[PDB]
């Protein structure tokens, strides 16, 4: 094998090697030194002269007169497989459960292609993540982009755990009538802590959804680089299994703010002039180089939905990162501050939340057909609740009207029984009916956004099961 | 013909090496793979380029060729029907080519070179020929579509190839000096094309929207924008506006849309839209589909794709209405360009030439005498989408200073059951003055004032609402109860107009001018009226009422009687309260 | 209202000015060591 001598230049991350021609740009190599140790590094830069590589570890052993570096690869390739189901990964491939490694069906360059735009369809069926206020009000349709903006201290982590070990598509509500169509999650964790990584092994293992997964697991002290590369390992999984064995796969990004402030220190490492608010010019791009290899496509059975999971810098919805997350997904969940320190889980707003996919995927044939209709009315006595509340503070109860009172006892129970859910599994059919319980304090008539049908065929319900039952 | 080698992959798409001849923003192929890309800077020996796609794999030593143009489109028979990217790229093609996904360096015509067109000369030897001129006829889709000479070519035929069938590079017209003209040009897309001269706006363009051709009026060739929010049934109003309006051809730009923008025009046009006569809509559109994770390169040019073959069709003969699907993400593409090249920023990141791109978009819009003698027009509808619904960034700024009409959707009126959602007080118009002449003589002598009592009645029934809000409705004297009900009339059977309902889809001028003088007769009555003595609620259930409301889904034919027959029965319900 | 909006407004005018500066700075310094790593190539 070609062994490449003749380093002249080694600072911080960046290392200097002459007579290299024949290094393509994007290559992996490998950097051996003095005692033997082997590192990793990519080849960022290539002249005639000289070509750059960038050490995705340390460099505290190397010299100039031992040093070498040879090729392992001229781009950056994956190997798949479908007996990835069950694994755990580093996030640049390698195994790390204490089995042996894979052997790969094929090898696949981790930064795909993009999709033909007459190639894809509209999405057309939900998916039921067991989580009330997601599925009534803000429904996850197969093929959509929907993040959830959390904040510093907030429960991220167990939401994600929970959706992910919860999650299912419902064929029987549709016509399908036979549950044949396979299941999978892909989780990427970028940056995480020791903590997490126990916590989310643990929750996998505790109950078979390791069965049915695949994770990607990266740690806060490991290399930018491999932090970088996490989201398109999995992403390259996903749209294998999708759209090669009709899969209908569930993508979770844990934190898409780690991601953001490693490149931007790798653009920073490479000296290029920064953009707006001090990240690369280049963010929108690339988050779009993620976020939209996400779908349906015409003509085959499989799809991919993706969830990001980011948290929003300082509670600041006009920060960059998810400024730019909100230009290009279709949604987003919003949790909670108040929620959380007044002792809900899930800490799910309603109010800014939203959905913008969610008339395709609703109605008779996806759903029950009263979806809708109940999710605007909820939507609309929620609010009217919270303002109600406020003013009795100043006004005092006795000086209310009655439907004002029946709005404030409503908006009470609602954030009681419909938010704060616990770790129950919720299917779409309990979660209607809560509503429908719900909905029964407000006197008929006032409920104008419902028609008359509707109105006439579930009414009258009272809480029965939310107490009658865990 | 100018051919080097790789000197230095320095990165994202950043190539060098000694190419003396090659010339600034030329096409060229890089590597072996033949990827894309521009030249920016020219040094010593050396050039450097900007490819499009990504350069991973990529080695020194690979060569680079240039084409020795710079980027540009193909304007021939062929684009109708048609669905490109944004530089002019067959999406359909390249599907059936490579699969569900586009491979990099993929290689397509835009025009078809293999499907035949039924030839029909038009002159004949000897004849001159300058710029401009027609040269022949080709049948395409129902309509004759012309073959011109390019801007720049003048001579003499020498001979003309007789009626048969040919291809679209088969040399249709030798002219004398050795030049042979083919069914198709080329132009570059960053350069105007030619025309003699610029007309005034002083015809209407109409859209069929009761609102917008009443209270905003736009002329040929003039310029709006509208907002994009969510749940203001933004689409719909596209998709009328395009499908009724009095355009000939229909140019569709999606620039850098969401992944989901097939599901309102990849999905949409093909099937669920047919024109007033005939089939399918899409026989006179060209779509420019154009979604987030393109090259940004594409991204940018869209625009100017769009406007070129828009210009093309207008020096042809016709009267063609453009619209862009967002231009704020265009801009972003933009600012995304010049940070590569280390660029001062402005405001806000953009570059400081912002406002000098969007006038070199927008004015090359207008009506004018073609080159060969024909007059067309141009008209262009963008879209501009805020981060937040902010209208003082600064591509909002730079917009509203060079259209002449805002159409502001707003999503209030939407949710509660107000279609079109156009909010009748931020919107506005500046091209009502130079059109009322065209309005008096087409329409109707006094078509100017009614418009201006009906804004007036608008804007006093606004003026009114806080004191509503207030105590209600039931609280308030006899004139504003009137008022109050007055523009509930209006805003509810003459501004609002249902898209799907197969005759209110659609409304002339002297429906909308019949629809105005009924109301503002009836409330002259009722004015006399409260003022004698008879109270409002003897009015309100007056059955004029549900005649002067239901005159919207009459047909164009049977609304002449319908109209003299209700103001007859205006006239009589008074006589009852005098 | 007003006077908050003003406020904000000008707090916002300031943190742009500032952030152009400095990247006028991080091109001039980018430059330099360009230049004077090729000076003595």
């Given at each position: ?12 991350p ?27 590094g ?12 960038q ?14 570096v ?16 069950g694994?755990?990964?580093?996030g ?10 894979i ?7 981790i ?11 509209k999405?057309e ?14 429904t ?48 990427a ?10 916590y ?6 505790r ?18 680089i ?8 999995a992403l ?79 509670d600041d ?50 759903t ?30 006795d ?6 009172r ?15 859910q ?33 109105i006439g ?10 107490w009658?039952?865990? | ?19 003396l ?27 450097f380029?900007?490819?499009?796609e ?10 680079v ?10 304007l ?15 999406l ?10 586009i ?33 022949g ?6 309509f ?11 001579g ?16 249709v ?54 907002p994009?929010?969510?749940g ?27 992944g ?66 967002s ?62 619904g ?8 730079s ?5 002449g009409?805002?159409?502001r ?8 059951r ?44 606004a ?58 007769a ?5 004015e ?44 009589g319900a ?5 | 209202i ?7 407004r ?10 152009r ?21």
């Amino acid at each position: 094998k070609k062994e490449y001598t003749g380093i002249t230049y080694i600072s911080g991350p960046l290392l200097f090697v002459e007579n290299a021609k024949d290094l393509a740009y994007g290559a992996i190599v490998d950097i051996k030194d003095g005692t033997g140790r082997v590192r990793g590094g990519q080849v960022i830069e290539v002249s005639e002269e000289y070509a750059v590589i960038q050490v995705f570890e340390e460099t505290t052993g190397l010299d100039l007169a031992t040093t070498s570096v040879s090729l392992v690869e001229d781009v950056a390739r994956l190997g798949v497989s479908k007996e990835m189901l069950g694994r755990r990964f580093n996030g640049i491939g390698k195994p790390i459960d204490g089995l042996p490694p894979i052997t790969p069906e094929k090898r696949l360059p981790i930064t795909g292609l993009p999709l033909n735009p007459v190639a894809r369809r509209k999405p057309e069926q939900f998916i039921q993540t067991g989580i009330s206020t997601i599925d009534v009000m803000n429904t996850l349709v197969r093929g959509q982009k929907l993040p959830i903006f959390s904040g510093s201290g907030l429960p991220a982590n167990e939401i994600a755990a929970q959706i992910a070990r919860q999650a299912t598509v419902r064929p029987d509500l549709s016509g399908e009538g036979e549950k044949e169509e396979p299941f999978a999650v892909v989780f990427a964790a970028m940056g995480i802590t020791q903590r997490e990584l126990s916590y989310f092994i643990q929750e996998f293992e505790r109950t078979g959804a390791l069965s049915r997964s695949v994770l990607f697991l990266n740690k806060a002290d490991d290399p930018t680089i491999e932090r970088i590369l996490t989201p398109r390992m999995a992403l390259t999984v996903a749209e294998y299994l999708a759209f090669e064995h009709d899969y209908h796969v569930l993508v979770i990004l844990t934190d898409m703010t780690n991601y953001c402030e490693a490149l931007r220190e790798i653009g920073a490492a490479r000296e290029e002039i920064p953009g707006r608010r001090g990240y690369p010019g280049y963010m929108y791009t690339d988050l779009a180089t993620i976020y939209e290899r996400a779908g349906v496509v015409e003509g085959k059975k499989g799809s991919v939905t993706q969830i990001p999971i980011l948290s929003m810098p300082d509670d600041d919805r006009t920060h960059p990162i998810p400024d730019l997350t909100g230009y290009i997904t279709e949604g987003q969940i919003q949790l909670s501050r108040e929620l959380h320190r007044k002792g809900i889980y899930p800490p799910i707003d309603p109010l800014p939340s939203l959905s913008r996919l969610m008339n395709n995927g609703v109605g008779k044939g996806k759903t029950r057909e009263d979806h809708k209709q109940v999710s605007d009315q909820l939507y609309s006595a929620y609010a009217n609740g919270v303002d109600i509340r406020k003013l009795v503070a100043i006004i005092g109860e006795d000086a209310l009207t009655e439907n004002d009172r029946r709005y404030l006892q409503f908006a009470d129970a609602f954030e009681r029984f419909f938010i704060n859910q616990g770790q129950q599994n919720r299917s779409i059919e309990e979660s209607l009916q809560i509503a429908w319980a719900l909905l029964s304090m407000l006197p008929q008539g006032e409920l104008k956004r419902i028609s008359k049908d509707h109105i006439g065929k579930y009414y009258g319900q009272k809480l029965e099961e939310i107490w009658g039952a865990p | 013909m100018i051919q080097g080698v790789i000197q230095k992959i320095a990165g994202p798409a950043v190539i060098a090496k000694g190419m003396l001849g090659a010339r600034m923003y030329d096409i060229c192929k890089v590597g072996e793979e033949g990827l894309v890309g521009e030249i920016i800077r020219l040094d010593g020996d050396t050039a450097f380029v900007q490819v499009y796609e990504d350069t991973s794999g990529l080695k020194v030593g690979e060569p680079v060729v240039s084409t020795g143009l710079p980027l540009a489109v193909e304007l021939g028979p062929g684009m109708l029907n048609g669905i490109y990217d944004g530089i002019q790229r067959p999406l359909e093609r390249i599907r059936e080519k490579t699969g569900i996904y586009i491979t990099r360096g993929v290689v397509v015509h835009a025009l078809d070179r293999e499907k035949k067109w039924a030839w029909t000369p038009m002159v004949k030897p000897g004849d001159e020929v300058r710029g401009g001129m027609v040269l022949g006829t080709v049948p395409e889709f129902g309509f004759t579509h012309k073959i011109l000479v390019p801007p720049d070519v003048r001579g003499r035929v020498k001979e003309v190839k007789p009626a048969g069938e040919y291809t679209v590079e088969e040399p249709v017209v030798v002219l004398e000096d050795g030049t042979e003209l083919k069914m198709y040009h080329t132009w570059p897309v960053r350069r105007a094309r030619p025309v003699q001269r610029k007309l005034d706006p002083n015809t209407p363009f109409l859209t069929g929207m009761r609102i917008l051709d009443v209270l905003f009026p736009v002329a040929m060739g003039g310029t709006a924008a509208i907002p994009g929010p969510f749940g203001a049934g933004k689409s719909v109003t596209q998709q009328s506006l395009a499908k009724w309006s009095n355009a000939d051809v229909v140019v569709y730009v999606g620039c850098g849309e969401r992944g989901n923008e097939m599901t309102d025009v990849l999905v949409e046009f093909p099937e669920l839209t047919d024109p007033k006569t005939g089939g399918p809509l899409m026989h006179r559109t060209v779509l420019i589909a154009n979604t987030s994770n393109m090259p940004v390169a594409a991204r940018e040019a869209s625009i100017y794709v769009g406007v070129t073959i828009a210009e093309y069709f207008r020096d042809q003969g016709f009267s063609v209405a453009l619209m862009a699907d967002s231009t704020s993400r265009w801009a972003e593409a933009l600012r995304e360009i010049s940070s590569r090249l280390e660029e001062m920023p402005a405001e806000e990141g953009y570059p400081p030439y912002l406002a000098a791109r969007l006038a070199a978009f927008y004015e090359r819009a207008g009506k004018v005498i073609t080159l060969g003698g024909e007059e067309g027009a141009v008209t262009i509808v963008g879209a501009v989408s805020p981060p937040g619904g902010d209208m003082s960034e600064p591509v909002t700024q730079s917009t509203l200073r060079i259209v002449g009409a805002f159409w502001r959707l707003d999503a209030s009126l939407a949710f509660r059951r107000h279609f079109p959602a156009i909010n009748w007080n931020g919107s506005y118009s500046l091209f009502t003055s130079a059109l009322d002449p065209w309005y008096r003589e087409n329409v109707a002598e006094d078509y100017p004032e009614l418009r201006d009592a009906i804004s007036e009645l608008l804007q006093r029934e606004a003026g009114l609402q806080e004191i509503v809000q207030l105590v209600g409705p039931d609280a308030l004297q006899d004139a504003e109860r009137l008022v109050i009900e007055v523009g509930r009339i209006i805003r509810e059977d003459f501004l609002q107009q249902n898209a799907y309902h197969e005759v209110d889809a659609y409304c002339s001028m002297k429906k909308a001018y019949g629809i105005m003088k009924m109301i503002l007769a009836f409330y002259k009555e009722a004015e006399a009226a409260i003022k004698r003595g008879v109270s409002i609620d003897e009015i309100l259930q007056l059955p004029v009422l549900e005649r002067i409301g239901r005159a919207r889904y009459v047909s164009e034919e049977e609304f002449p009687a319908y109209f003299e027959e209700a103001m007859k029965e205006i006239q009589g319900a008074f006589k009852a309260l005098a | 209202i007003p006077g908050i909006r003003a406020q904000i407004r000008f707090i916002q005018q300031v943190l742009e000015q500032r952030e152009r500066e400095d990247t006028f700075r991080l091109k001039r310094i980018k430059g330099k060591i360009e230049a004077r790593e090729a000076e003595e190539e």
